Amino acid sequence: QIMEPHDTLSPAQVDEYRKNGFLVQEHVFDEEEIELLRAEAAQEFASGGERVTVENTGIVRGVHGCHLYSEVFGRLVRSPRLLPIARQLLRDDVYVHQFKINAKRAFKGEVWEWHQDYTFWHHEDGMPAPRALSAAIFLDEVTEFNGPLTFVPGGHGSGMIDADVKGEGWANTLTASLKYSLDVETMRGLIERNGMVAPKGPRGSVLWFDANIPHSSVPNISPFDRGLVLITYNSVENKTDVTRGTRPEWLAARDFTPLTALQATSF
């Protein structure tokens, strides 16, 4: 049987990723593949227990660490459409630091405050450097009006930015109101210098973005959902210092075994 040979990014695509801190590949997965991922996401929301977050409404907001519990999601992170590019960009073997599905229901979502993901991973999880990235799979078309991820392009180039801390514990690392949000003034400067961009794309697209790029999103006023599957790949050399870790495995992985690609089988 045959998997399609590993595809990697072009030099131009790599350059664009390093400069901007994000990159969209359209139509990586087809509709049937997206429907399978959507059905598995629904199962995870229903059966995820303590791994599930909820929104004012008690409506499901997020589920975490699904690659450890779902055979489908365990295979997805090894996909030949994903793993080769993560290896290319991080210039290493890689593993999954974090996995989450963020629902942003039609008419329903919440405001994710400005943040850098690395700030959490560094301070909560002991990630020593920002040699990590996230792949966001669009389960639905992402538009202007359904609460797209919004970035400051080039905003990753200064590194970790000083952030207000709010409360001990980790409960508020997954909430609308975030543990590390960005100085109102620091953001103004960044945006005045670099601007703001919300990448769009059809269902089945993949949005790659740097661990350190500032991002945000608003509620969904469209009649259409905005499901994102977010896979955070980390360089194996950049494995986190488990002695400085504070969160469970379904938020911050502790098995640093290098991922290998999915091969074709008869089942």
The answer to whether the CB of 101 falls within 8 A of the CB of 228 is: yes
What is the pattern of x (binds ligand AKG, CB under 6 A) and - over residues 131-170? ------------------x---------------------
Binding residues with Fe ion: total (CB under 5 A): 1
User: Could you say whether residue 222 binds ligand AKG (CB under 6 A)?
Assistant: no
140-to-103, 154, 163, 225, 227 alpha-carbon distances in Å: 10, 26, 32, 7, 6
Provide the minimum distance between the beta carbon of 111 and ligand PRO in the complex, in angstroms, as a whole number: 13
User: Could you say whether residue 174 binds ligand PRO (CB under 6 A)?
Assistant: yes
The answer to whether the CB of 25 falls within 8 A of the CB of 206 is: yes
256-to-14, 116, 195 alpha-carbon distances in Å: 25, 23, 36
Residue 228 contact partner, candidates ligand AKG, Fe ion, ligand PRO, none, CB within 5 to 8 A by sort of partner: ligand AKG
User: Could you say whether residue 110 binds Fe ion (CB under 5 A)?
Assistant: no
**How is 31-79 classified by DSSP, letter by letter?**
HHHHHHHHHHHHHHHHH-GGGEEE-----EEEEE-GGGT-HHHHHHTT-
DSSP type of residue 124: I
Contact residues for 6 (Cβ-Cβ < 8 A; gap 6+): 80, 84, 261
Stretches 61-69, 81-89, 110-118, 164-172: which one binds Fe ion (CB under 5 A)? 110-118
Residue 173 contact partner, candidates ligand AKG, ligand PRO, Fe ion, none, CB within 5 to 8 A by sort of partner: ligand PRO
User: Could you say whether residue 228 binds ligand AKG (CB under 6 A)?
Assistant: yes
Fill in the amino acid letter for 77.
V
| Residue whose Cβ sits closest to Fe ion | 117
Provide the minimum distance between the beta carbon of 8 and ligand PRO in the complex, in angstroms, as a whole number: 26
Contact set for ligand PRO, span 208-267 (CB under 6 A): none
The answer to whether the CB of 239 falls within 8 A of the CB of 256 is: yes
Binding residues with ligand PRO: total (CB under 6 A): 7
Contact set for ligand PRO, span 89-118 (CB under 6 A): 98, 115, 117
Provide the minimum distance between the beta carbon of 204 and ligand AKG in the complex, in angstroms, as a whole number: 17
Rule CB under 6 A: choose which of 120, 151, 208, 209 binds ligand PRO: 120
Question: d(Cα 155, Cα 5) in Å, to the nearest integer?
Answer: 34
| Strand order, beta sheet including 150-151 | 112-115, 215-217, 150-151
DSSP type of residue 171: G
Question: d(Cα 101, Cα 221) in Å, to the nearest integer?
Answer: 20
User: Could you say whether residue 215 binds ligand AKG (CB under 6 A)?
Assistant: yes
Residues at the annotated binding site?
Answer: 100, 102, 104, 115, 117, 173, 215, 217, 226
Residues at the annotated binding site for Fe(3+)?
Answer: 115, 117, 215
Residues that bind ligand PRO (CB under 6 A): 98, 115, 117, 120-121, 173-174
Residues that bind ligand AKG (CB under 6 A): 100, 102, 112, 117, 149, 215, 217, 228
